Swiss-Prot record, chain B:
Name the record gives this protein: DNA-directed RNA polymerase subunit beta
This protein's encoding gene: rpoB
Known uses: Co-administration of salinamide and rifampicin or salinamide and myxopyronin suppresses the emergence of resistance to both antibiotics.
Family: Belongs to the RNA polymerase beta chain family.
Function: DNA-dependent RNA polymerase (RNAP) catalyzes the transcription of DNA into RNA using the four ribonucleoside triphosphates as substrates. Resistance to the antibiotics salinamide A, salinamide B, rifampicin, streptolydigin, CBR703, myxopyronin, and lipiarmycin can result from mutations in this protein.
Summary of subunit composition and partner proteins: The RNAP catalytic core consists of 2 alpha, 1 beta, 1 beta' and 1 omega subunit. When a sigma factor is associated with the core the holoenzyme is formed, which can initiate transcription. The rRNA transcription and antitermination complex (rrnTAC) consists of RNAP, NusA, NusB, NusE (rpsJ), NusG, SubB, ribosomal protein S4, DNA and precursor rRNA; S4 is more flexible than other subunits. In pull-down experiments interacts with CedA. (Microbial infection) Interacts (via flap domain) with Escherichia phage lambda antitermination protein Q; this interaction renders bacterial RNAP resistant to transcription pausing and allows it to read through termination signals.
Signal peptide feature range: none
Post-translational changes noted in the entry: Acetylated on several lysine residues in the presence of glucose.
From Swiss-Prot, chain C:
Modifications after synthesis and translation: Acetylated on several lysine residues in the presence of glucose.
Function: DNA-dependent RNA polymerase (RNAP) catalyzes the transcription of DNA into RNA using the four ribonucleoside triphosphates as substrates. Resistance to the antibiotics salinamide A, salinamide B, rifampicin, streptolydigin, CBR703, myxopyronin, and lipiarmycin can result from mutations in this protein.
Shown residues within the full chain: 790 to 839 of 1407
Gene giving rise to this polypeptide: rpoC
Protein species of origin: Escherichia coli (strain K12)
UniProt: Zn(2+) 2 binding residues: 25
Applications: Co-administration of salinamide and rifampicin or salinamide and myxopyronin suppresses the emergence of resistance to both antibiotics.
Name recorded for this polypeptide: DNA-directed RNA polymerase subunit beta'
UniProtKB/Swiss-Prot annotation, chain D:
Top-level taxonomy: Bacteria, Pseudomonadati, Pseudomonadota, Gammaproteobacteria, Enterobacterales
Any one GO biological process: DNA-templated transcription initiation
PANTHER family membership: DNA-DIRECTED RNA POLYMERASE SUBUNIT OMEGA
EC number(s) on file: 2.7.7.6
Family, as annotated: Belongs to the RNA polymerase subunit omega family.
Name of the protein described by the UniProt record: DNA-directed RNA polymerase subunit omega
Catalytic activity: RNA(n) + a ribonucleoside 5'-triphosphate = RNA(n+1) + diphosphate
Organism: Escherichia coli (strain K12)
Length: 376, 48, 50, 79, 99
DNA sequence: ATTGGCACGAAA
DNA sequence: TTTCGTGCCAATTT
């Protein structure tokens, strides 16, 4: 429901993009904002995650006491609140092709409901409904700190709250969108991908949609100074959480769910994946009161990270896409660097314990482990 | 202690003589494994 | 019991060849260690981790 | 008798090298004709070697020096 | 295949083989059993295959075909670098275990 | 039973 | 003509 602090201390916000609403409170427009409780000594004691579109009673650096609500938000409803204050005009908003008119029977407080591409007509398939924030003169009000005009798109199953021609302000919701044990350790050490993985971003920059329902939906990422034509395939049947009007980083999620360790290794590095594995294993073991040092899990993770994939041949004899030993690549690169040449470049690979133990350089040990016929 | 035919006899003789030393040798099961793998048409051998 | 035995056998197999064969490698890389905090409770202090 | 080997480990510095040095000394005292450097009290060669190592009378360098001296003396007295 | 329109690895049937014999005669050779597989393995040149596969790999663009070509090239290179020969996978003499 | 690799079939 | 999904087979279980 809401964050309830337990002790007294200062409040700190990490990765926060928040603005003051009309009522005077603070609303967060950043997905990866984290709230921390740091006392006067400087040691953090409590940490929480603040969802997108939440109201903060206090600000950064303010002093709070125990038993106090610091943040509040609606869990089932995802706000699409704005930053600039002005009138709302409907662009590419046509009834019977992209939206529908449904009136509440009892409450009587209802407005147009934005339809989805799976229900709306074909004519509205190529049309993107949007709400544009303007001033009393009708001109587009540019967002402070930027130059692009302020317009927000609306996905499917969006219930518009306020009708056209009604003044709004910052923090006002335009629309509402409704929503262990031994095997766990075995899956963690085998690096098995979960049934419903979490969908991440490969490159940074602004994000946008693409062709709709071409088998499955598509996404496009345009970096500020990177490679624009990159694109990704993402099914639309899963509840997405991307912001087409906000820039996303490669260390950010698109959908939600359990995250595959391979993606973590590919996108964040060795330290992130080893920390994730150690933390998961220790979380599993701690509930039973078992005390195990982290050195053992660290050496296991190190043994899992024993393979590399070449990304360019370079001066070495390694071909374009063969999987080889990391130590051999390091030895070859340090030997070539002393000759004035340029070494090859590689990407680390993550293997499960069963798969990593079958890829050793010694065939006697591999045949002793299992799958004797194939190894021999 | 298990499968070195010459090593067992040498260790027993040394123990009876008050010399607690051993000559390890090669296990016989490894030779059996080598023969069985060779019977499958695969050339496996020790070198150097 | 059988699952525990299979897991420990795989763990032994994957790391049987790792031995301390040096005194210092001279590296400067490392990992950052911080206390484990979940919500408003600290389950693991920094002392037991470093 | 012996219940602990901590002092011998501290003298040598490593548990793995202590075993090798003690085995070398015990084999010298058992198969060879060497006499103990400490007053033996119904003890076996391994315990006697451990007690010698604890007192500081036996280490790897001392054994190497003794072997070199014995070889030189034998080669000199051969003629 | 000879001068006829039969490839070097086409799979025939009994009626098809009889028709081919009655039409073309002895201008083509067709076999069955392990002898045919040994003949196919013995007449295959490894360097030319490696070079042709490398040309096909570097020219065309694909994902699954690229992986298949890479795997076959790796197998061919493994055969070439070692002293083994492809026809040794067909047994002619059978070892016998000691009694 | 469970998991993963491989050939096959339908679709962009 | 490529690309992802579905059915089949082989591996594993102190």
């Amino acid at each position: 429901s809401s964050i309830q602090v337990k002790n007294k201390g200062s409040i700190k916000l990490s990765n926060v993009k928040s603005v003051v609403n009309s009522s005077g409170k603070l609303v967060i427009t950043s997905r990866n904002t984290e709230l921390k409780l740091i006392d006067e000594f400087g040691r953090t004691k409590e940490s929480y995650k603040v969802p997108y579109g939440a109201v903060l009673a206090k600000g950064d650096g303010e002093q709070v006491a125990g038993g106090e609500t610091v943040a509040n938000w609606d869990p089932h409803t995802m706000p699409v609140i704005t930053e600039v204050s002005g009138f709302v005009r409907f662009t590419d908003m046509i009834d019977g092709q992209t939206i529908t008119r449904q009136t509440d029977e009892l409450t009587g407080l209802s407005s147009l409901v934005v339809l989805d591409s799976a229900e709306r007509t074909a004519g509205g398939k190529d049309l993107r409904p949007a709400l544009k924030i303007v001033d009393a003169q009708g001109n587009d009000v540019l967002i402070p700190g930027t130059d692009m005009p302020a317009q927000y798109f609306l996905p499917g199953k969006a219930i518009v709250q306020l009708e056209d021609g009604v003044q709004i302000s910052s923090g006002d919701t335009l629309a509402r969108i409704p929503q262990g044990g031994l095997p766990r350790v075995a899956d963690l050490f085998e690096a098995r991908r979960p049934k419903e993985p979490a969908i991440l971003a490969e490159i940074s920059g602004i994000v946008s949609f693409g062709k709709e329902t071409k088998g499955k939906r598509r996404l496009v990422i345009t970096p500020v100074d990177g490679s624009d034509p990159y694109e990704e395939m993402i099914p639309k049947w899963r509840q997405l959480n991307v912001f087409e009007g906000e820039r996303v980083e490669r260390g950010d999620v698109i959908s939600d769910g359990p995250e595959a360790p391979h993606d973590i290794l590919r996108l964040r590095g060795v330290h992130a994946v080893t920390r994730y594995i150690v933390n998961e294993v220790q979380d599993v073991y701690r509930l039973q009161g078992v005390k195990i040092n982290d050195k053992h899990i660290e050496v296991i993770v190190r043994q899992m990270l024993r393979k590399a994939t070449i990304v360019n041949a370079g001066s070495s004899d390694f071909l374009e896409g063969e999987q080889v030993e990391y130590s051999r690549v390091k030895i070859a690169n340090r030997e070539l660097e002393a000759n004035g040449k340029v070494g090859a470049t590689y990407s680390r690979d993550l293997l499960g314990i069963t798969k990593a133990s079958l890829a050793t350089e010694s065939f006697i040990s591999a045949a002793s482990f299992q799958e004797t016929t194939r190894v021999l | 202690k298990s499968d070195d035919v010459n090593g067992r006899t040498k260790m027993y003789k040394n123990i009876v003589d008050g010399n607690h030393q051993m000559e390890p040798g090669m296990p016989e099961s490894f030779n059996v494994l080598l023969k069985e793998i060779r019977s499958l048409g695969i050339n496996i051998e020790l070198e150097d | 019991t059988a699952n525990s035995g299979y897991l420990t056998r795989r763990l032994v197999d994957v790391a049987q060849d790792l031995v301390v064969t040096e005194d210092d490698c001279g590296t400067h890389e490392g990992i950052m260690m911080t206390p484990v905090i979940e919500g408003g409770d600290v389950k693991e202090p920094l002392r037991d981790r470093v | 008798a012996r219940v602990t080997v901590q002092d011998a480990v501290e003298k040598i510095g490593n548990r793995f090298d202590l075993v090798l040095v003690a085995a070398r000394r015990a084999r010298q005292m058992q198969v060879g004709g060497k006499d103990p450097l400490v007053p033996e009290e119904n003890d076996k060669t391994t315990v006697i070697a451990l007690r010698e190592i604890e007192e500081g009378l036996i280490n790897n360098q001392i054994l190497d020096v003794r072997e070199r001296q014995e070889q030189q003396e034998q080669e000199a007295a051969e003629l | 295949g000879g001068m006829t329109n039969l490839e070097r690895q086409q799979i025939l049937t009994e009626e098809q083989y009889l028709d081919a014999l009655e039409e073309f005669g002895d201008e083509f050779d067709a076999k069955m059993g392990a002898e045919a597989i040994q003949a196919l393995l013995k007449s295959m040149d490894l360097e030319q295959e490696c070079e042709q596969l490398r040309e096909e790999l570097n020219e065309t663009n694909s994902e699954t075909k690229r992986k298949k070509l890479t795997k076959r090239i790796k197998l061919l290179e493994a055969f070439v670098q070692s002293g083994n020969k492809p026809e040794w996978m067909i047994l002619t003499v059978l070892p016998v275990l000691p009694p």
